[PDB]
Amino acid sequence: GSHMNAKILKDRRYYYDYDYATRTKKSWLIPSRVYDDGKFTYINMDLTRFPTGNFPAVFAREKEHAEDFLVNTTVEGNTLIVHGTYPFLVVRHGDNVVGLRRNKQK
């Protein structure tokens, strides 16, 4: 605008490209929706199967065969908020596991 650009709030982009692969066949372990914005990755899963606050563990990966980073995660209803954007994510429900990947654009 005038001289500079006064940009209100953060630029938001809920990044909707992610894929899942899993060796489990339980539909209640596979995420139904994933999206990040900036850092916080929102993972909608069937967390309603997990009572007593016994929610599953989620890890982040820098690469698909990298180490599983425990990271910071908050659980809002059925959505896991992973604090920090990583190209790959790993979700572990008990001893079952699902892998997510965030796909870059070109």
Binding site: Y16, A21, R23, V34, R101
Partner: peptide, 23 residues
């Protein structure tokens, strides 16, 4: 320790198109 590939088998997109691209 995970002495086996965690994920694989079927890489399928799960991109947010839950009903609409967002709404």
């Amino acid at each position: 320790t995970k002495p086996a590939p965690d994920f694989g088998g079927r890489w399928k997109h799960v991109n947010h198109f839950d009903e609409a691209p967002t709404e």
